[PDB]
Design an enzyme around this catalytic site. Sequence first.
Site, PDB file in Angstrom:
ATOM      1  N   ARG A 243      54.997  34.240  38.633  1.00 53.85           N
ATOM      2  CA  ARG A 243      53.566  34.083  38.221  1.00 53.85           C
ATOM      3  C   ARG A 243      53.116  34.948  37.293  1.00 53.85           C
ATOM      4  O   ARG A 243      52.901  36.181  37.531  1.00 53.85           O
ATOM      5  CB  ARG A 243      52.646  33.762  39.565  1.00 53.85           C
TER       6      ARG A 243
ATOM      7  N   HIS B 170      43.028  34.790  34.150  1.00 58.53           N
ATOM      8  CA  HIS B 170      43.159  36.031  34.770  1.00 58.53           C
ATOM      9  C   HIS B 170      42.034  37.373  34.460  1.00 58.53           C
ATOM     10  O   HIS B 170      42.625  38.228  34.351  1.00 58.53           O
ATOM     11  CB  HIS B 170      44.404  36.335  35.282  1.00 58.53           C
TER      12      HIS B 170
ATOM     13  N   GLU C 166      40.914  33.932  41.180  1.00 59.92           N
ATOM     14  CA  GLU C 166      39.930  34.664  41.778  1.00 59.92           C
ATOM     15  C   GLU C 166      38.393  34.461  41.300  1.00 59.92           C
ATOM     16  O   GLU C 166      38.095  35.715  40.951  1.00 59.92           O
ATOM     17  CB  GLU C 166      40.390  36.194  42.080  1.00 59.92           C
TER      18      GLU C 166
ATOM     19  N   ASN D 282      45.237  33.609  47.323  1.00 58.66           N
ATOM     20  CA  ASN D 282      45.329  35.112  47.356  1.00 58.66           C
ATOM     21  C   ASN D 282      44.883  35.803  48.676  1.00 58.66           C
ATOM     22  O   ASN D 282      43.675  35.592  48.908  1.00 58.66           O
ATOM     23  CB  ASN D 282      44.703  35.781  46.229  1.00 58.66           C
TER      24      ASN D 282
ATOM     25  N   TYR E 116      44.861  38.958  51.166  1.00 54.84           N
ATOM     26  CA  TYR E 116      44.919  40.498  51.422  1.00 54.84           C
ATOM     27  C   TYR E 116      44.715  40.972  52.547  1.00 54.84           C
ATOM     28  O   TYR E 116      45.355  41.786  53.313  1.00 54.84           O
ATOM     29  CB  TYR E 116      44.470  41.198  50.440  1.00 54.84           C
TER      30      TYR E 116
ATOM     31  N   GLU F  84      49.086  35.269  45.758  1.00 60.45           N
ATOM     32  CA  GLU F  84      49.201  36.819  45.716  1.00 60.45           C
ATOM     33  C   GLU F  84      49.215  37.291  47.189  1.00 60.45           C
ATOM     34  O   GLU F  84      48.435  36.807  48.053  1.00 60.45           O
ATOM     35  CB  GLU F  84      47.764  37.604  45.211  1.00 60.45           C
TER      36      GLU F  84
END
Length: 472
Positions: A77, A122, A167, A309, A311, A376
């Site tokens: 990616r 991005h 995002e 994504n 985290y 991610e």
Amino acid sequence: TVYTFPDEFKLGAATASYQIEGAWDENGKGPNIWDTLTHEHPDYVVDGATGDIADDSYHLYKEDVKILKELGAQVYRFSISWARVLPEGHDNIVNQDGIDYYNNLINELLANGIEPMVTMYHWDLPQALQDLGGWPNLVLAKYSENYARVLFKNFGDRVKLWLTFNEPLTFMDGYASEIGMAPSINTPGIGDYLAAHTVIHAHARIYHLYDQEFRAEQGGKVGISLNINWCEPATNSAEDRASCENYQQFNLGLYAHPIFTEEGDYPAVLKDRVSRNSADEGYTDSRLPQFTAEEVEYIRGTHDFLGINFYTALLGKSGVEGYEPSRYRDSGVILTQDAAWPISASSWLKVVPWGFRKELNWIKNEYNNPPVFITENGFSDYGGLNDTGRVHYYTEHLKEMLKAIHEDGVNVIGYTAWSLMDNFEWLRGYSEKFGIYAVDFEDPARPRIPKESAKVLAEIMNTRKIPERFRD
């Protein structure tokens, strides 16, 4: 079996253009908002760092492919720099050097058996478009369509996995602070919502464009990458649970309700809380922009998969805090982190692997189990090759994801680690390291060298399972 990847599941690694490419003004590339931020406002960035060179992947892309091949990645990616392709933002000028560069990267990946997955946006908006107001100005939705058409026409014969945006929950915050993410504009509670609105319109135009002009011929899939933290109730009360639902809707639902539900539109709690707060503050009009019924219908269903994504997690409790106006204040949750959770080199990022499984279940239930590609997941430290914290982070998160797949029936279809290599971490500069490969930013050759996490991820990708020594 709970430790084995499904046969069709795709594993790989991820990067983004401004974070890795360098060559910021080389061979016709136009300036973007991160060129502007790092050049004009080095006081906003740790060490006054810039992406002027970064990993020099504009020149060293063959080295990136080499390490992806060594890792055993099935998918890579990466993102395309808008201003490298369309230096003026608008589609009047197409920079052939930019076309050649991304073709070179795509062709190198395919020659080495690695599938490209391309993020169109991005965070690196052409400065010429920010000068019109950037994302709060709805005219950018048509500009985004025109950019995507150039990308589909040039690359879509070979690229079958696309993400429109990465995002927007984060990059909308570039309109909610004078010292934050580019373009560093202080319009919290107002401009960030306008930015979200334009992004959703832009995403929908790009999806419809693909349907109308390219899908029959190209046969690929178009999604969007949305970040979301798990939000765990601080206590088991109904009121703290409500606050966590508010969090999911104000952070993931802001983007995913319009696109991924049958109903479309923003979540009701988002519309209602902003409307009430705006009225109480004396505005004639709600600070939240509105979709017409025709727009709701156009936007809903514009997806072939959901990119996530993931985290970390937060604790949420009932209440309201933050400045008036702001999205955090509007969201009606008080957010904290538990001191017991393991730390990283990033203040916002604590290790809470079970939160990943909870989040995947929340998404399965809210959006009727869409195919989810984890675009991610990763961990920061300050340096070092014996990155035991990163190894633990990946092995735990992958175990939790595999439980979501096998035990909970969540349709997770792929996973790309953030990041292939240490890179420019936005306002943190080079100070926070997310790579599975280390890069020496003091060495003009920018060598990439494997950390222990790269070796462990290679072992996982090769064996297609979690090694015994990392199992519970």
